[PDB]
Structures are given as structure tokens and as C-alpha cells.
């Protein structure tokens, strides 16, 4: 632990990849030209509690979709960078816009495009379903899988390492 917690303690921004992280990775099409994407419910409460404890939420995704716009809005995710292959540059751009540093950003991804941003963020996360190279470069690997609570699990970890986890639990107790 130790190193993980200090990295997580100084986080002001959590920035997410969509496919493989917020969803399990299925790109779903149908015979009328419609697209579908699945998200996990427990991820929703975790993100909410990070917003309310003071952390700014962001999405950086290489694909563009309405489903992502619809989920981000309802979740209180504030910055939505769609159609962006270069994750680092978007993350650096938010850092200058919000007036923080890479060291104050947490980043979670699952594939090669995320690699630099996971490497250069203060706290870089990946998932079991994530590829070999991106996992080698991360400060933490989740126990749960993309679209099955990987985000929630890291939400609770940042909350713990900020001694904010009990405030959150107690509102339901």
C-alpha cells in the first residue's frame, strides 16, 4: 500500500476512459443503425460521492456517443472529452483549465491509447481486462472488471486515502 495512498491522497481530479472501464467493452449494434452501451449501477454512487467530497470528474474517450452524454450528465460528470485518441493531451489541457497539475489528477484506462496518461498522472489506474503494457505502468490495478465496479472500487480507495470514506458511509448509516 503506502505509495498508493499518498498518490491517492493528493487527488483533485479523477478522469475516466469509457470502454473497458465504465463499460465491459461491448460495442453493440442493431439492424436499424442504433448503438447501445451498458454501464454498471454501483459505479454511479461512487462517482457521486467523489463529486461531493470535492473531486472534479472528467471523461476522456476516443469514441463519440449520446449514451456517454446521457450517463455523464446524470452522474455529475462535468467534463466530457469525446472523439479524443490522445488522452494525455486532453488531461494536460484540463489541468491548465482548472489550474491544477498532473500530480493532482487520477487517471483510469484499459488500453494502449490510455498508456501515457496512466503513466504521467499522479495516480494511474488500470483493470484486469486492461492490456499488458498499460497495467505495467499503473500505480493500482482494480480487483473488479470494467463495467462491473472497477470505478466504484477506486472511488472508495480515493475516499479512504483522503479520510473521507467514513463521512460517506455514515450518511447511509
Shortest Å, Cβ 154 to a copy of itself: 14
Candidates 3, 99, 163, 172; binder of a copy of itself (CB under 8 A) is 172
**Should residue 4 be labelled a site residue for a copy of itself when binding is judged by CB under 8 A?**
no
Three cell numbers written together for 101: 497539475
Candidates 4, 67, 80, 92; binder of a copy of itself (CB under 8 A) is 67
Give the gyration radius of the chain's Cα atoms.
15
**Should residue 40 be labelled a site residue for a copy of itself when binding is judged by CB under 8 A?**
yes
List of residues 6+ apart from 82 with CB closer than 8 A: 59, 61, 63, 64, 65, 68, 69
- Determine the size of the site formed for a copy of itself (CB under 8 A): 42
13-16/105-108 β-pairing: parallel
From first CA to last CA, the distance across the chain in angstroms is 28
Candidates 2, 30, 143, 163; binder of a copy of itself (CB under 8 A) is 30
- Rank residues 20 and 149 by Cβ distance to Mg ion and give the closer one: 20
Q: Could you write out the three-class secondary structure of 47-59?
A: HHHHHHCCCEEEE
Which residues form the interface with a copy of itself (CB under 8 A)? 19-20, 25-42, 44-45, 65-67, 70-71, 110-113, 115-116, 119, 131, 133, 147-148, 169, 171-173
Amino acid at each position: 500500500m503506502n505509495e498508493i495512498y499518498q498518490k491517492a491522497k493528493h487527488i483533485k481530479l479523477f478522469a475516466m476512459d469509457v470502454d473497458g472501464i465504465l463499460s465491459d467493452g461491448q460495442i453493440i449494434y442493431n439492424s436499424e443503425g442504433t448503438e447501445t452501451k451498458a454501464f454498471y449501477v454501483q459505479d454511479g454512487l461512487g462517482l457521486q460521492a467523489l463529486k461531493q467530497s470535492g473531486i472534479i470528474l472528467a471523461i476522456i474517450t476516443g469514441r463519440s456517443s449520446a449514451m456517454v452524454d446521457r450517463r455523464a450528465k446524470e452522474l455529475g460528470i462535468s467534463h466530457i472529452i469525446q472523439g479524443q485518441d490522445d488522452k494525455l493531451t486532453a488531461l494536460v489541457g484540463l489541468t491548465k483549465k482548472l489550474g491544477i497539475e498532473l500530480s493532482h489528477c487520477a487517471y483510469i484506462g484499459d488500453d494502449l491509447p490510455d498508456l501515457k496518461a496512466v503513466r504521467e498522472a499522479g495516480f494511474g489506474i488500470s483493470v484486469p481486462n486492461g492490456c499488458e503494457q498499460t497495467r505495467a505502468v499503473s500505480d493500482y490495478i482494480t480487483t473488479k472488471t470494467g463495467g462491473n465496479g472497477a470505478v466504484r472500487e477506486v472511488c472508495e480507495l480515493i475516499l479512504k486515502a483522503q479520510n473521507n470514506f467514513d463521512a460517506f458511509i455514515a450518511t447511509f448509516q
